[PDB]
From Swiss-Prot:
Subcellular location: Cytoplasm; Cell membrane
Alpha-carbonic anhydrase domain location: 1-257
Name under which the protein is recorded: Carbonic anhydrase 2
Provenance organism: Homo sapiens (Human)
Cofactor annotation remark: Zinc. Can also use cobalt(II) with lower efficiency, but not copper(II), nickel(II) and manganese(II).
EC number: 4.2.1.1, 4.2.1.69
Subunit structure: Interacts with SLC4A4. Interaction with SLC4A7 regulates SLC4A7 transporter activity. Interacts with SLC26A6 isoform 4 (via C-terminus cytoplasmic domain).
Binding site for Zn(2+): H92, H94, H117
Length: 258
């Protein structure tokens, strides 16, 4: 497959190789704050990252993934809309060429400059590959980024990017604490959806935090020096690696907060 975010292989083309692109539970979506309803059935959300073990950072040609040891329950998400335990496998971001776009979810049609996705898989299915085949297989914690003050906890990521400029490059990335990327409040919206990149599988419980984090212009400008291309190939800046909002269809977005 040769999908991407270019002039000829972008999101509008994905359906040809991945027909589920036009499915009933595709992500991302626009979150209409005046239709989303507070849900008192939601249990407390628990983000348990104290024992997180990051390992490596990889430029995969469509974003970079910070990868974790998910061989045991070291960093998990539980509670909220979730039943059981979801293990952190990786995080990554989506960002724009300019600050006025970049996020995948939108809030009353507002686009943020970027969006962070912490991806977790349901341990009841044993491994990630099995989990993506199930409607309750993944939980993705989505966090909006706006440009303002620097995010201190992000700078260790920013500073390694020069070492993974091109597709296929990776670097050791141990001892990174994902708690440093959270906002103050864990208020969220939740709905059932999908992966936002091919294969677009409809396996995700989305938990999208209401409070954005702030990063500095200098930090985002470093993300925009990454490359989609491999070493020595014509330079294609890694920008605008976001899928636009997809139809909500029958779905309901629930708020954790009154
Ligand atoms: Zn993502």
């Amino acid at each position: 497959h040769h999908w991407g975010y270019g002039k000829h292989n972008g999101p509008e083309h994905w359906h040809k190789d991945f027909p589920i692109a036009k499915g009933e539970r595709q992500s991302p979506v626009d979150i209409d704050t005046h239709t989303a309803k507070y849900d008192p059935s939601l249990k407390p959300l628990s983000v348990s990252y104290d024992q997180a073990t990051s390992l490596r950072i990889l430029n995969n040609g469509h974003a970079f993934n910070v990868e974790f040891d998910d061989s045991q329950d070291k960093a998990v998400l539980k509670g909220g809309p979730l039943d059981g335990t979801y293990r952190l496998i990786q995080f990554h971001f989506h960002w724009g060429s300019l600050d006025g776009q970049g996020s995948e979810h939108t809030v009353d049609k507002k686009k943020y400059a970027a969006e962070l996705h912490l991806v977790h898989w349901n341990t009841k299915y044993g491994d990630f590959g099995k989990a993506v085949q199930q409607p309750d297989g993944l939980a993705v914690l989505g966090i909006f980024l706006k440009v303002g003050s620097a995010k201190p906890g992000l700078q260790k990521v920013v500073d390694v990017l020069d070492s993974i400029k091109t597709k296929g490059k990776s670097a050791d990335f141990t001892n990174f604490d994902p708690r440093g990327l959270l906002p103050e409040s864990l208020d969220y919206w939740t709905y059932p959806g999908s992966l936002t990149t091919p294969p677009l599988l409809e396996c995700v419980t989305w938990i999208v935090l209401k409070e954005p984090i702030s990063v500095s212009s200098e930090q985002v400008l470093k993300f925009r020096k990454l490359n989609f291309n491999g070493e020595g190939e014509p330079e294609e800046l890694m920008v605008d690696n976001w899928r636009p909002a997809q139809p909500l269809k029958n779905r309901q977005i629930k708020a954790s907060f009154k």
